[PDB]
Amino acid sequence: WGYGKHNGPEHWHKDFPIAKGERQSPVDIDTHTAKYDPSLKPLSVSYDQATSLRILNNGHAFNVEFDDSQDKAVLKGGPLDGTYRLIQFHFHWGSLDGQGSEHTVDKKKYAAELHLVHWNTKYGDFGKAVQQPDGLAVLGIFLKVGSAKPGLQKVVDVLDSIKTKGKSADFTNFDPRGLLPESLDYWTYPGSFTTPPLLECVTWIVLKEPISVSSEQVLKFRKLNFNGEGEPEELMVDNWRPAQPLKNRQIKASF
Numbered sequence: 001w002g003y004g005k006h007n008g009p010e011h012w013h014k015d016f017p018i019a020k021g022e023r024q025s026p027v028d029i030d031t032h033t034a035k036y037d038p039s040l041k042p043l044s045v046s047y048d049q050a051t052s053l054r055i056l057n058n059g060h061a062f063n064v065e066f067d068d069s070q071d072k073a074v075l076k077g078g079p080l081d082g083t084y085r086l087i088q089f090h091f092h093w094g095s096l097d098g099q100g101s102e103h104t105v106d107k108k109k110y111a112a113e114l115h116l117v118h119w120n121t122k123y124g125d126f127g128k129a130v131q132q133p134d135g136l137a138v139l140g141i142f143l144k145v146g147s148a149k150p151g152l153q154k155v156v157d158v159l160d161s162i163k164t165k166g167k168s169a170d171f172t173n174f175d176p177r178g179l180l181p182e183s184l185d186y187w188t189y190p191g192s193f194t195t196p197p198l199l200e201c202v203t204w205i206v207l208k209e210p211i212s213v214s215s216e217q218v219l220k221f222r223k224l225n226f227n228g229e230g231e232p233e234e235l236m237v238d239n240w241r242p243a244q245p246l247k248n249r250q251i252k253a254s255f
Protein backbone atom coordinates (compact mmCIF):
# COMPACT_ATOMS: atom_id res chain seq x y z
CA TRP A 1 0.00 0.00 0.00
CA GLY A 2 1.38 3.54 -0.32
CA TYR A 3 0.22 6.96 -1.40
CA GLY A 4 0.71 6.94 -5.16
CA LYS A 5 -1.84 6.66 -7.99
CA HIS A 6 -1.65 2.90 -8.11
CA ASN A 7 -1.46 1.99 -4.44
CA GLY A 8 -2.89 5.02 -2.71
CA PRO A 9 -5.86 5.53 -0.33
CA GLU A 10 -8.53 4.80 -2.95
CA HIS A 11 -7.11 1.30 -3.49
CA TRP A 12 -6.66 0.39 0.19
CA HIS A 13 -10.11 -1.18 0.49
CA LYS A 14 -9.14 -4.12 -1.68
CA ASP A 15 -6.61 -5.40 0.83
CA PHE A 16 -8.22 -3.91 3.97
CA PRO A 17 -12.04 -3.93 3.56
CA ILE A 18 -12.32 -2.04 6.88
CA ALA A 19 -11.39 1.05 4.75
CA LYS A 20 -15.10 1.37 4.04
CA GLY A 21 -16.14 0.84 7.70
CA GLU A 22 -18.30 2.88 10.04
CA ARG A 23 -15.67 4.70 12.19
CA GLN A 24 -12.84 5.48 9.77
CA SER A 25 -10.47 8.41 10.20
CA PRO A 26 -9.54 11.17 9.41
CA VAL A 27 -12.71 13.29 9.23
CA ASP A 28 -13.55 16.90 8.57
CA ILE A 29 -14.24 18.67 11.84
CA ASP A 30 -17.24 20.95 11.20
CA THR A 31 -16.89 23.46 13.99
CA HIS A 32 -20.53 24.49 13.93
CA THR A 33 -21.96 20.99 14.28
CA ALA A 34 -19.50 19.80 16.94
CA LYS A 35 -21.26 19.50 20.30
CA TYR A 36 -19.80 21.35 23.28
CA ASP A 37 -19.90 18.71 25.98
CA PRO A 38 -19.41 20.20 29.48
CA SER A 39 -18.73 16.80 31.12
CA LEU A 40 -15.54 16.34 29.08
CA LYS A 41 -12.59 16.63 31.50
CA PRO A 42 -9.28 18.52 30.87
CA LEU A 43 -6.57 16.46 29.17
CA SER A 44 -3.65 15.36 31.35
CA VAL A 45 -0.38 14.98 29.42
CA SER A 46 2.38 13.75 31.76
CA TYR A 47 5.45 13.57 29.55
CA ASP A 48 8.18 14.63 32.03
CA GLN A 49 9.49 11.04 32.29
CA ALA A 50 9.61 10.34 28.57
CA THR A 51 12.41 8.25 27.11
CA SER A 52 12.91 8.35 23.34
CA LEU A 53 14.89 5.55 21.88
CA ARG A 54 15.24 5.92 18.09
CA ILE A 55 13.95 7.52 14.90
CA LEU A 56 13.11 5.33 11.98
CA ASN A 57 12.11 5.87 8.35
CA ASN A 58 9.52 3.10 7.73
CA GLY A 59 8.80 3.76 4.06
CA HIS A 60 5.78 6.00 4.61
CA ALA A 61 6.67 8.30 7.54
CA PHE A 62 9.44 8.57 10.15
CA ASN A 63 8.53 7.54 13.70
CA VAL A 64 10.25 8.55 16.94
CA GLU A 65 9.91 5.50 19.24
CA PHE A 66 9.58 5.68 23.02
CA ASP A 67 10.25 3.22 25.76
CA ASP A 68 6.74 2.14 26.84
CA SER A 69 7.61 -0.65 29.38
CA GLN A 70 6.57 1.62 32.24
CA ASP A 71 4.15 4.52 32.76
CA LYS A 72 6.77 7.04 31.69
CA ALA A 73 4.90 9.33 29.28
CA VAL A 74 1.15 9.05 29.68
CA LEU A 75 -2.12 10.63 28.58
CA LYS A 76 -5.28 10.49 30.73
CA GLY A 77 -8.31 12.71 31.42
CA GLY A 78 -10.21 14.24 28.52
CA PRO A 79 -12.63 11.64 27.11
CA LEU A 80 -10.47 8.78 28.33
CA ASP A 81 -10.92 6.29 30.98
CA GLY A 82 -7.66 4.78 32.12
CA THR A 83 -4.08 5.58 31.40
CA TYR A 84 -2.70 5.47 27.89
CA ARG A 85 1.07 5.10 27.31
CA LEU A 86 3.03 6.95 24.60
CA ILE A 87 4.66 4.53 22.23
CA GLN A 88 5.63 6.70 19.16
CA PHE A 89 4.90 9.89 17.24
CA HIS A 90 5.04 10.55 13.47
CA PHE A 91 3.86 13.25 11.07
CA HIS A 92 1.89 13.42 7.85
CA TRP A 93 2.88 16.34 5.53
CA GLY A 94 2.32 17.69 2.05
CA SER A 95 4.38 18.55 -1.01
CA LEU A 96 3.14 22.17 -0.71
CA ASP A 97 2.19 24.10 2.46
CA GLY A 98 -1.54 24.19 1.78
CA GLN A 99 -2.07 20.47 2.22
CA GLY A 100 -0.62 17.87 4.51
CA SER A 101 -2.90 17.34 7.52
CA GLU A 102 -5.29 14.40 7.58
CA HIS A 103 -8.00 16.02 9.64
CA THR A 104 -9.36 19.31 8.36
CA VAL A 105 -11.24 22.00 10.31
CA ASP A 106 -14.18 23.37 8.24
CA LYS A 107 -12.44 21.91 5.23
CA LYS A 108 -9.17 23.80 5.97
CA LYS A 109 -6.04 21.56 5.38
CA TYR A 110 -2.84 22.46 7.34
CA ALA A 111 0.78 21.89 6.25
CA ALA A 112 1.26 18.84 8.46
CA GLU A 113 -0.24 16.85 11.34
CA LEU A 114 1.59 15.36 14.31
CA HIS A 115 0.19 12.13 15.81
CA LEU A 116 1.27 11.03 19.31
CA VAL A 117 0.10 7.43 19.59
CA HIS A 118 -0.85 6.00 22.97
CA TRP A 119 -2.18 2.53 23.98
CA ASN A 120 -4.54 1.71 26.88
CA THR A 121 -2.45 0.06 29.58
CA LYS A 122 -5.29 -2.12 30.88
CA TYR A 123 -4.72 -4.24 27.78
CA GLY A 124 -1.13 -5.22 28.71
CA ASP A 125 0.65 -4.52 25.41
CA PHE A 126 0.08 -2.62 22.13
CA GLY A 127 -0.85 -5.80 20.22
CA LYS A 128 -3.71 -6.43 22.60
CA ALA A 129 -4.89 -2.78 22.54
CA VAL A 130 -5.49 -3.00 18.78
CA GLN A 131 -8.09 -5.74 19.51
CA GLN A 132 -10.25 -3.35 21.54
CA PRO A 133 -12.62 -0.45 20.55
CA ASP A 134 -10.90 1.81 23.15
CA GLY A 135 -7.43 0.37 22.81
CA LEU A 136 -5.75 3.57 21.48
CA ALA A 137 -5.80 7.34 21.86
CA VAL A 138 -3.96 9.47 19.28
CA LEU A 139 -3.32 13.12 20.10
CA GLY A 140 -3.33 15.05 16.81
CA ILE A 141 -1.69 18.48 16.45
CA PHE A 142 -1.88 20.62 13.35
CA LEU A 143 1.25 22.37 12.04
CA LYS A 144 1.03 25.71 10.19
CA VAL A 145 4.05 27.36 8.48
CA GLY A 146 5.25 30.44 10.33
CA SER A 147 8.12 30.84 12.80
CA ALA A 148 10.47 27.94 13.64
CA LYS A 149 9.36 25.65 16.47
CA PRO A 150 12.71 25.42 18.41
CA GLY A 151 11.66 22.07 19.99
CA LEU A 152 11.27 20.44 16.51
CA GLN A 153 14.83 21.21 15.46
CA LYS A 154 16.59 18.08 16.85
CA VAL A 155 14.15 15.97 14.83
CA VAL A 156 14.79 18.01 11.68
CA ASP A 157 18.56 17.76 12.20
CA VAL A 158 18.68 13.93 12.35
CA LEU A 159 16.54 13.39 9.22
CA ASP A 160 19.50 13.14 6.86
CA SER A 161 20.66 10.07 8.69
CA ILE A 162 17.40 8.23 8.01
CA LYS A 163 16.76 9.35 4.45
CA THR A 164 15.64 6.03 2.99
CA LYS A 165 13.30 3.21 3.98
CA GLY A 166 14.59 0.93 6.69
CA LYS A 167 17.20 3.30 8.17
CA SER A 168 17.18 4.24 11.84
CA ALA A 169 19.28 6.31 14.22
CA ASP A 170 19.49 6.31 18.01
CA PHE A 171 17.44 9.27 19.23
CA THR A 172 17.59 9.49 23.02
CA ASN A 173 16.63 12.26 25.44
CA PHE A 174 14.16 14.04 23.08
CA ASP A 175 11.43 15.73 25.12
CA PRO A 176 8.00 15.65 23.37
CA ARG A 177 6.72 18.57 25.47
CA GLY A 178 8.46 20.98 23.03
CA LEU A 179 5.89 20.07 20.36
CA LEU A 180 2.72 20.94 22.32
CA PRO A 181 0.62 24.11 21.72
CA GLU A 182 -0.14 26.46 24.57
CA SER A 183 -3.78 25.43 24.96
CA LEU A 184 -5.06 21.91 25.38
CA ASP A 185 -8.57 22.59 24.07
CA TYR A 186 -9.73 19.74 21.83
CA TRP A 187 -12.30 17.91 19.75
CA THR A 188 -12.81 14.16 20.16
CA TYR A 189 -14.61 11.50 18.20
CA PRO A 190 -14.28 7.65 17.82
CA GLY A 191 -12.20 6.61 14.80
CA SER A 192 -9.42 4.49 13.34
CA PHE A 193 -5.77 4.30 12.36
CA THR A 194 -5.27 6.35 9.17
CA THR A 195 -2.82 3.86 7.59
CA PRO A 196 -3.43 0.12 6.90
CA PRO A 197 -4.49 -1.96 8.80
CA LEU A 198 -7.03 0.96 9.49
CA LEU A 199 -8.30 -0.73 12.69
CA GLU A 200 -11.11 1.03 14.50
CA CYS A 201 -9.59 1.15 17.97
CA VAL A 202 -8.82 4.87 18.34
CA THR A 203 -10.27 7.68 20.40
CA TRP A 204 -9.04 10.72 18.51
CA ILE A 205 -8.24 13.91 20.41
CA VAL A 206 -7.47 16.72 17.96
CA LEU A 207 -6.19 19.96 19.48
CA LYS A 208 -7.74 23.21 18.51
CA GLU A 209 -4.49 25.24 18.47
CA PRO A 210 -1.83 24.58 15.76
CA ILE A 211 1.89 24.89 16.37
CA SER A 212 3.95 26.99 13.91
CA VAL A 213 6.99 25.51 12.27
CA SER A 214 9.20 27.40 9.73
CA SER A 215 9.26 26.79 6.00
CA GLU A 216 12.84 25.47 6.39
CA GLN A 217 11.78 22.92 9.01
CA VAL A 218 8.94 21.44 6.91
CA LEU A 219 11.19 21.47 3.78
CA LYS A 220 13.53 19.04 5.51
CA PHE A 221 10.61 16.55 5.85
CA ARG A 222 10.06 16.77 2.12
CA LYS A 223 13.63 15.54 1.47
CA LEU A 224 12.95 12.09 2.94
CA ASN A 225 12.49 9.10 0.64
CA PHE A 226 9.77 6.43 0.37
CA ASN A 227 12.13 4.07 -1.40
CA GLY A 228 15.00 2.10 0.07
CA GLU A 229 18.64 2.80 -0.60
CA GLY A 230 19.66 2.14 -4.17
CA GLU A 231 16.07 2.30 -5.48
CA PRO A 232 14.62 5.02 -7.76
CA GLU A 233 14.10 8.03 -5.57
CA GLU A 234 10.49 8.80 -4.60
CA LEU A 235 10.22 11.85 -2.32
CA MET A 236 8.19 11.25 0.79
CA VAL A 237 5.51 13.88 0.43
CA ASP A 238 1.74 13.82 0.67
CA ASN A 239 1.60 10.81 2.94
CA TRP A 240 -1.93 11.65 4.18
CA ARG A 241 -5.30 9.95 3.84
CA PRO A 242 -8.27 12.14 2.74
CA ALA A 243 -11.20 12.74 5.10
CA GLN A 244 -13.72 9.94 5.49
CA PRO A 245 -17.57 9.96 6.04
CA LEU A 246 -18.48 10.79 9.59
CA LYS A 247 -21.41 8.29 9.20
CA ASN A 248 -23.39 9.39 12.34
CA ARG A 249 -20.66 9.83 14.84
CA GLN A 250 -20.72 13.07 16.81
CA ILE A 251 -17.65 15.25 17.33
CA LYS A 252 -17.56 16.60 20.86
CA ALA A 253 -15.66 19.78 21.74
CA SER A 254 -14.15 20.59 25.15
CA PHE A 255 -14.78 24.32 24.61
Ligand SMILES: CC(=O)Nc1nnc(S(N)(=O)=O)s1
Binds near residue numbers: 115192193195197
Ligand atom coordinates in the same frame (compact mmCIF):
# COMPACT_ATOMS: atom_id res chain seq x y z
C1 LIG B 1 1.72 1.01 14.81
C2 LIG B 1 0.97 2.31 14.65
O1 LIG B 1 1.11 3.21 15.48
N1 LIG B 1 0.20 2.32 13.56
C3 LIG B 1 -0.52 3.39 13.26
N2 LIG B 1 -1.19 3.29 12.16
N3 LIG B 1 -1.84 4.45 11.90
C4 LIG B 1 -1.60 5.31 12.84
S1 LIG B 1 -2.29 6.93 12.76
N4 LIG B 1 -1.81 7.45 11.33
O2 LIG B 1 -3.75 6.85 12.82
O3 LIG B 1 -1.82 7.70 13.95
S2 LIG B 1 -0.59 4.82 14.13
Ligand SMILES: [Hg+2]
Binds near residue numbers: 132
Ligand atom coordinates in the same frame (compact mmCIF):
# COMPACT_ATOMS: atom_id res chain seq x y z
HG1 LIG C 1 -10.18 -2.29 17.55
Ligand SMILES: [Zn+2]
Binds near residue numbers: 090091092115194
Ligand atom coordinates in the same frame (compact mmCIF):
# COMPACT_ATOMS: atom_id res chain seq x y z
ZN1 LIG D 1 -0.61 9.35 11.69
